[PDB]
Amino acid sequence: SKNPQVDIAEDNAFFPSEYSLSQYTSPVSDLDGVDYPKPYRGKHKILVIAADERYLPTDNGKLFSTGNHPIETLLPLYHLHAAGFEFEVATISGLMTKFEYWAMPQKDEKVMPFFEQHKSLFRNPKKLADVVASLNADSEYAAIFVPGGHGALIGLPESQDVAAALQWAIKNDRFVISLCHGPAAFLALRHGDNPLNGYSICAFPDAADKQTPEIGYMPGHLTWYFGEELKKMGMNIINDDITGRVHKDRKLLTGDSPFAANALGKLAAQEMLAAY
Amino acid sequence: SKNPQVDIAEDNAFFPSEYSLSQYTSPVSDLDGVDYPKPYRGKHKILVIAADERYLPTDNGKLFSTGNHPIETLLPLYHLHAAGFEFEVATISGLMTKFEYWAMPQKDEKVMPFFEQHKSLFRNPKKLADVVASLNADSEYAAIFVPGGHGALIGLPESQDVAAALQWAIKNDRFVISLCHGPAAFLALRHGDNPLNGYSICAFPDAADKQTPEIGYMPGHLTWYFGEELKKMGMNIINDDITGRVHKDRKLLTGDSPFAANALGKLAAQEMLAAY
């Protein structure tokens, strides 16, 4: 079935079709290379900038019931966690993180407990402007993580706060991690001062969510395409399709989809393990 | 069956009898009041001083296969974790933590994942002397946790390092948490300078492990009784029996057995949540 599914909680909102839900999600994740015997004992923690809105408006007025992608959020954080790095969630507003539970790997003996044990952190997130105002060369963060999910497409791309946050990190030689539509957040720098210019990155292809609606993943088409906007902001998007590969470009680690979440996690842990 | 059980790994070592193993352990724990919506976002982490030796010598030459008690180690750490506080394990030697796996709640859907996700921290612990040498009024610890298990009876009670560590905490108004035979570690102050003098505490009763061997919990009797030694060091031990109750005495939070692990955890989280 490729028909979008009603989300009774909102006026004209829809979840992904049964066909696509089984096409791109699973009751169990690919969590894999969690081998880290010499864990980081420092004090630096990953800063996770998440989405506080679940509904994204499409071309036909219907709302898309999205949010942050669990796999893209939890797999990386899982590896980074087991590697000794703790994480602190923040939202532009401070409202709770909005997840796409339809892509949550219920029935995963490792990912769910991990989630349950850090749920409060997403539920009672910090307001990004508070975090930003305390940012100094000594801020103990080590990296900013912007997880995927169409939710990242709302809010973050026009946030003066996500901008500052990012400029602070690249300025202070910190890592920046992201995947799926998360880089759409980098668009918050398009209005002058873009320390993320000539950086190569791999994200979700515009051509991908150009067609996904043809199978009901979305109740309609996107109002715009973040991919080409990044191209105009001077960033290089490696992939033109969905391949599940991840790329490293001097502290900038990224992936193109739920398919690259595990690899992006290993790449992150192993790379920061070395830096710290 | 009250007969001690051979531990083929050591010369004349024995695990607790089947009767006592079912008397004092369970495949599932009492982990309970894990309700913490406003978690600590600071940087202070609990400092866990654990045992690096598994075998304790008894009155009859037989070795007792003990170590750190999982429940007394993991329940408190579980609550403190979900409350936003991270922990860092240390051993006098730096050798891996030695647990009493015969008391590990295999089959516990929450405690085992928690364990698995922080196993490395116990496996590759830090050497307490290294931690001590960096201790200053700014050390970001907030509390020192000395978990129970007869393992705490070996090494720690004569450690110049556990002593310094403890003096540093009470001096710097930090918390000190412990249960079972863990307070036996406080005996490391008996030789002058005991900021733990007139403090009341509840621990495992001498009379308890005076009789436990009568059912095979231990292959023999203890070479000495830490309980009375604490009494002589000027500390007040509330309980005279095993009751599973926990006590608070100005930053000193303690419990008397595996039975008080959950409560000691709630008391710890809730009390530090307030201090931080």
A–B CB contacts, 8 A cutoff, strictly below: 52
Q: How far apart are CA A177 and CA B134, in angstroms?
A: 32
Residues preceding gaps in chain B (C to N > 2.5 Å): none
Q: How far apart are CA A73 and CA A201, in angstroms?
A: 18
Distances from the Cα of B139 to the Cα of B13, B136, B167, B172, angstroms: 40, 5, 13, 9
Q: How far apart are CA B109 and CA A117, in angstroms?
A: 12
Q: Is residue A121 less than 8 Å (CB to CB) from chain B?
A: yes
CATH number of the domain residue B209 falls in: 3.40.50.880
Other beta carbons within 10 Å of A274:
7
Percent helix, strand, coil in chain B, to 5, is 35, 20, 45
Nearest CA among B177, B94, B183, B172 for reference residue B140: B172
A55 forms bridges with which residues in the sheet? Answer: A65
Nearest CA among A123, A130, A69 for reference residue A97: A123
Residue B146 belongs to domain spanning: 1-276
Burial (CB count within 10 angstroms: exposed 0-12, middle 13-18, buried 19+), residue A259: buried
Nearest to B120 among A39, A43, A113 (CB): A39
**DSSP structure class, residue B5:** E
A126 forms bridges with which residues in the sheet? Answer: A90
A81 labelled as ligand-binding?
yes
Q: Residues for chain A: how many in total?
A: 276
Q: How far apart are CA B162 and CA B149, in angstroms?
A: 16
Q: What backbone phi and psi angles, to 5 degrees, belong to A13?
A: -105, 150
C-alpha angle A100/A102/A104, rounded to 5°?
80
Q: Is the dihedral of CA B154, B159, B165, B167 positive or negative?
A: positive
Interface of B with A in 2-61 (CB under 8 A): 36-39, 41, 43, 45
Q: Do B43 and A140 touch (CB under 8 A)?
A: yes
Interface of B with A in 123-152 (CB under 8 A): 123-124, 126, 140
Burial (CB count within 10 angstroms: exposed 0-12, middle 13-18, buried 19+), residue A223: exposed
Q: Is residue B117 less than 8 Å (CB to CB) from chain A?
A: yes
Q: How many domains does chain A have?
A: 1
Provide the phi-psi class of B14: left if phi over 0, else alpha when psi is between -120 and 50, else beta. beta
Nearest to A110 among B82, B113, B121 (CB): B113
A201 forms bridges with which residues in the sheet? Answer: A237
A180 is an active site residue? yes
User: Which experimental technique did the depositors report for determining this structure?
Assistant: X-ray
Helix (H), strand (E), coil (C) string for chain A: CCCCEECCCCCCEEECCHHHHHHHCCCCCCCCCCCCCCCCCCCCEEEEEECCCCEEEECCCCEEECCECHHHHHHHHHHHHHCCCEEEEEECCCCCCCECHHHCCCCCCCHHHHHHCCHHHHHCCEEHHHHHHCCCCCCCCCEEEECCCHHHHCCHHHCHHHHHHHHHHHHCCCEEEEECCHHHHHHHHCCCCCCCCCCEECCCCCCHHHHHHHHCCCCCCECCCHHHHHHHCCCEECCCCCCCCEEEECCEEEECCHHHHHHHHHHHHHHHHHHC
In Å, what resolution does this model reach?
A: 2.8
Other beta carbons within 10 Å of B267:
20
- Contacting residues for A191 by C-beta, under 8 A, at least 6 apart: none
Q: What backbone phi and psi angles, to 5 degrees, belong to A210?
A: -90, -35
